Scaffold this active site. Structure first.
Site: not given
Lengths: 242, 242
Positions: A10, A12, A87, A89, A159, A165, A205
């Site tokens: 992922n 960013k 989803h 998050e 997740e 994070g 994580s």
């Protein structure tokens, strides 16, 4: 017997293409033996750069959260076949309903995509012991909008929000459990052939140090990695899927 | 003469009921001299909690990324009258179009909300000289869907993607340069009356130490704060809006 594992990245960061470019070359030069499907989801604006530059035969490119029919169609026309839906998050932060993500999964599958659906509970829910409920409810909503054959195009990523994070990671037992739980529900609601074939990735994580152990779990079929996928150690995470 | 400033706080930490609860107590007990509208945008999941504990008369609650007619209605009945649309980030990360954010702004305003629309360029666009064209294209798209009277419900946040959570704050002159373009555009296309009344807030790595000098710029009307809004220095940021 496990289905093909998956190691998904992922991306960013917002301060170069220099680093991405160098990581991509690192990935392009890495040797991967076992059967594994790697996935890199860069930012929409890095999609073109990534496609041309990434050449490893075991890596494919994924888009993220395409909130529109026209969005799905243009991605598919451009040569993108994977999409990740965050989803867990979006449910926590903006109140996105389970029905709405279920609809988006169905829409993505019908549009020709392989879909990685991120489902998970909040810290408060995990706190009060609702991982079981929250997680199966999201999976139930998704099943309501999917045909049996659709599951061949679907991947579930557990997740949990509290793992995203924060430096907190589920233990090899605390992830195996919710994973075993998902597979058994799928088995009894949809079929044993679908449940066994289903990749259930763990995300939150994950790093090069814990990958190895989590994967040894019977119902863990790979990882969804954020912060650690921007580093050379992703190579280790991949290797850990054997 | 500058219009009323805004100090906007965006919350996203997970394991947070106690931490957030402490901050709220902290804000509630803070004495705020001048005229400033403070805004707090907790994650959906802490909406009710924040709405029950926050009571300072210079603070309102905002929802982040409310994307549904059914969802605005809920918000509107729950008493939430502000919404923040993270367009600069969604554009960069998911390809969200300028036309879709313009439709959302118009939808929110038609429903009685005050809207903080977040516009901005990517790192790549900034490094290649495209900031102006990119930002002005975003504001023009939003304008197309607004009547003159609707601007009273609108607040613009200039939020460059390369400054969000990266520590790389825009310089005082960088922010003034872009805010000036934005205001010039509005004055010329819409009216000098509308332009002088418009709040143009800056967001991206704002903190207690850099706020003061940013607000000294003629066309800066306030801030959108992410990570520093979770800390006690948010107080400092608020005080800096004079």
């Amino acid at each position: 017997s496990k289905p093909q594992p998956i190691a998904a990245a992922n991306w960013k960061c917002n301060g170069s293409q220099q680093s991405l470019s160098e990581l991509i070359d690192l990935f392009n030069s890495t040797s991967i033996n076992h059967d594994v499907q790697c996935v890199v989801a860069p930012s929409f604006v890095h999609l073109a750069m990534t496609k041309e530059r990434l050449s490893h035969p075991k890596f494919v490119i994924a888009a993220q959260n395409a909130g529109n029919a026209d969005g799905l169609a243009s991605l598919k026309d451009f040569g993108v076949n994977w999409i990740v839906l965050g989803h867990s998050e979006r449910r926590a932060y903006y109140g996105e309903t389970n029905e709405i993500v279920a609809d988006k999964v169905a829409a993505a599958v019908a549009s020709g995509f392989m879909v990685i659906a991120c489902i998970g509970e909040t810290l408060q829910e995990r706190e009060s012991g609702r991982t079981a409920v929250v997680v199966l409810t999201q999976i139930a909503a998704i099943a309501k909008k999917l045909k049996k054959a659709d599951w061949a195009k679907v991947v579930i990523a557990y997740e949990p929000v509290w793992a995203i994070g924060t430096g907190k990671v589920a233990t090899p037992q605390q992830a195996q459990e919710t994973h075993a739980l998902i597979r058994s529900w799928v088995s009894s609601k949809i079929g044993a052939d679908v449940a066994g074939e289903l990749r259930i990735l763990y995300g939150g994580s994950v790093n090069g140090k814990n990958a190895r152990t989590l994967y040894q779990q019977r119902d863990v079929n790979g990882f969804l990695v954020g912060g650690a996928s921007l580093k050379p150690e992703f190579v280790d995470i991949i290797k850990a899927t054997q």
